[PDB]
Amino acid sequence: CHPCPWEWTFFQGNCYFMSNSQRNWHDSITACKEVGAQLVVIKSAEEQNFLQLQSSRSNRFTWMGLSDLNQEGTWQWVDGSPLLPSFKQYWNRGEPNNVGEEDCAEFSGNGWNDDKCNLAKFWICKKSAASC
Ligand SMILES: OC[C@H]1O[C@H](O[C@@H]2[C@@H](O[C@@H]3[C@H](O)[C@@H](O)O[C@H](CO)[C@H]3O)O[C@H](CO)[C@@H](O)[C@@H]2O)[C@@H](O)[C@@H](O)[C@@H]1O
Ligand SMILES: [Ca+2]
Numbered sequence: 001c002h003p004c005p006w007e008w009t010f011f012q013g014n015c016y017f018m019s020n021s022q023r024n025w026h027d028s029i030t031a032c033k034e035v036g037a038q039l040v041v042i043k044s045a046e047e048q049n050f051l052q053l054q055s056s057r058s059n060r061f062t063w064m065g066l067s068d069l070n071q072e073g074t075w076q077w078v079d080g081s082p083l084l085p086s087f088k089q090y091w092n093r094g095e096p097n098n099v100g101e102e103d104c105a106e107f108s109g110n111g112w113n114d115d116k117c118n119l120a121k122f123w124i125c126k127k128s129a130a131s132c
């Protein structure tokens, strides 16, 4: 037994998967579901701080489970939870700007950015760690 599957990352009881391939936002949701996970939903500042660091180090644009697809300007996580006021400090200066219609969020540099959902980027899946 192992708390997390091979190649996954463990942080505070959860296992994360930083993909090595790219998909568009919608296809990233599916990829995670197939492996019993979910396109990463950030529940705490600590989590955010941990993922932001790994992502900036990866030097890769990465999708998170966040979007304003149903209602422009209103950011909602894929689990259904809404984006809280304390998390809005993480958008990159000048973001989100919806330039060209960007309804999906990604880790970019030191913060978040909204981009076209049909673009292919890397993604992070999240699921509970196994205790044993
Ligand atoms: O056409 C350029 C676009 O630039 C600004 O919009 C930003 C921009 O972000 C880029 C992008 O993430 C990548 O090139 O890395 C850069 C630095 O590492 C970063 O600045 O482009 C994306 C993609 O269109 C946008 O989502 C961002 O908001 C704005 O100036 C736009 O008005 C301008 O069209
Ligand atoms: Ca829109």
Ligand SMILES: [Ca+2]
Pocket: 068, 072, 073, 098, 101, 102, 103, 104, 114
């Ligand atoms: Ca938008």
Ligand SMILES: [Ca+2]
Pocket: 095, 096, 097, 098, 099, 102, 113, 114, 115
């Ligand atoms: Ca943007």
